[PDB]
Subunit: 159 residues, 4 copies
């Protein structure tokens, strides 16, 4: 069973902008760029919402890697423990997706947390999805395509 | 309601020197230099105190970024937790402002703790300001211009 | 007294592949390569099992250094505490040997955990050895050649 | 009141060798080299013991910087907490002096723990000195020349 966020926040504009603000030394910038686009598009293909990439300033969905405290109330904590977090749609921090630089991330060719899967999960949150009780769902709390539960949920929110 | 430090320490000389001793890889050195000057000047414009920049040795206000233990009794602790500290006016460590290198700092163009705001708060301490009970104040314990409370407080001390 | 793993898992194929997926800045890549080969061969000479090195993709025994969370349920934790872990033979994570990048590793010419000894111990696990109660054994829980206990154990498992 | 180590271990040879095995990115290698020599010589001038520098392999007194676990039973722990440790005279680890790379060290021109003072204290241990109860002593547990207590203690031991 999928979940949304309390009060069911969602992007209400036809177009939502996103920006990859900071990268990881674990991967080429372009790899992160392509994987983020692939993640967004997985959700995008199921709903009447369009994403537009911006390379500077503020965008609706701010995506990036950071070490320690980084401007919100959920500072990262070094290697292990918390790995990432994302915020439900809304202004400011809303929609943003942050990844802890102190972990090891991979595109699949090395050791590490698979970035595509993690990004697809985090971006699910950025769009308004909560965690699912269905182990098959990308939105399941713990850890390729969206499951029926993920699709049902996102379409229910957008629709 | 603004606060000062116990015994209300303040710089008693007409001129107070400052030095940016160490920088962060998160930003250009010159950016940190300019933001520090801007922060000091925000307080400076309200009082009969003049700041003089020095680029070597000891200055009254020593400013810098550090990882872990760094020569005082308040070692930093890695990503998260403590982010920075500054000491009330006085000799030696007095007036110094230290920032934890293990966080992410920004000038506003990326993810991170906004350095200008953090520096303005920390330098407030370096000049003798304590924390305020007024949420509008730059000296409020948690997180652009100085509020009426900040101004009232600094002018009361100098003034 | 040597130990194996519950249910005594072992590689059942004549040839087992291995790959050094990630390295440490503490040593040249080639040094890690040579020490891994030496470690494997120490066990290899005692049993009817052959190792084949691969330099890309997946291999049966995936070996590497990582910081923090890295794709399994045993994230590393920064300097100190956990130093490494390896998994009993089996598919997927089975057989893999991971080393925490946040420690200092050496080939013997500097300060650090001796990589050859650590790798020989970890690879013992990758082959199906558990910890020994014999302090002379390379498989003893705490810390050059395999002891009689190590040999007896690996030969008992292979066989 | 100065202290020595239980059983009063000391170097019994006329010549004791030392090697700086690893350095810190905080300072030039040559700076660390010169400060170590200065520290040793401070103790050396008070006793009938001669120090000989070696640049490779093993020396009686192994000196270096390390992150996390590094080959002894006192792994470092990242920024803060433990900063350094040294072992009483003896074979193997005996006499060695280790410094945590995760702190900030300085030669006096920047922010950080003053390396000369820290090295003089640590090397005191490497020679057989324990902590002093005299706040004036370099061997006092918490923090330029050796005090009367330091001199009395080292001369009593040598001796
Ligand atoms: O999204 C973030 N997570 O929930 C955080 C909790 C943050 C809580 C939080 N929220 C808001 C603020 C602070 N903290 C936990 S996580 O370990 O980072 N998360 C587990 C599931 N994982 C998967 C799962 C399945 C798959 Br397929 C791929 N990856 C994605 C990443
Ligand atoms: O200044 C230092 N802080 O108080 C430290 C505590 C150190 C305590 C301490 N003092 C002395 C020694 C050791 N520890 C807390 S902090 O998180 O670093 N601080 C919060 C408020 N923040 C703001 C707030 C408002 C705005 Br606008 C911008 N930034 C500035 C930074
Ligand atoms: O192999 C891994 N270890 O057991 C881990 C525990 C992981 C437990 C674990 N297992 C699985 C998953 C998570 N955690 C402990 S360790 O400190 O990394 N280990 C001690 C012995 N050491 C030696 C000993 C003797 C010699 Br000679 C050389 N090196 C090899 C390394
Ligand atoms: O030497 C090491 N220290 O005692 C360690 C404890 C290790 C304990 C330990 N021993 C052995 C093994 C593990 N842990 C404490 S420390 O903070 O690293 N130490 C304080 C005094 N400091 C001074 C003091 C005065 C001056 Br002047 C300069 N520097 C030198 C450095
Ligand atoms: Ca983390
Ligand atoms: Ca946003
Ligand atoms: Ca911190
Ligand atoms: Ca000062
Ligand atoms: Ca570790
Ligand atoms: Ca495997
Ligand atoms: Ca430390
Ligand atoms: Ca020694
Ligand atoms: Zn965040
Ligand atoms: Zn989640
Ligand atoms: Zn400090
Ligand atoms: Zn403050
Ligand atoms: Zn692992
Ligand atoms: Zn083990
Ligand atoms: Zn040590
Ligand atoms: Zn000591």
């Amino acid at each position: 069973g999928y979940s949304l966020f309390p009060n069911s926040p969602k992007w209400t504009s036809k177009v939502v902008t996103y920006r990859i603000v900071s990268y990881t030394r674990d991967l080429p910038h372009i790899t992160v760029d392509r994987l983020v686009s692939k993640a967004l598009n997985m959700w995008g293909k199921e709903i009447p919402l369009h994403f537009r990439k911006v390379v500077w300033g503020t965008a609706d969905i701010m995506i990036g890697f950071a070490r320690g405290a980084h401007g919100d109330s959920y500072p990262f904590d070094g290697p292990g423990n918390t790995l990432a977090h994302a915020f439900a749609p809304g202004t400011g921090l809303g929609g943003d997706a942050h990844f802890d630089e102190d972990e090891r991330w991979t595109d699949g060719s090395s050791l590490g947390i698979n970035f595509l899967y993690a990004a697809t999960h985090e971006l699910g949150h950025s769009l308004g999805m909560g965690h699912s009780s269905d182990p098959n769902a990308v939105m399941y709390p713990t850890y390729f395509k969206l499951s029926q539960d993920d699709i049902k949920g996102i379409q229910k929110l957008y629709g």
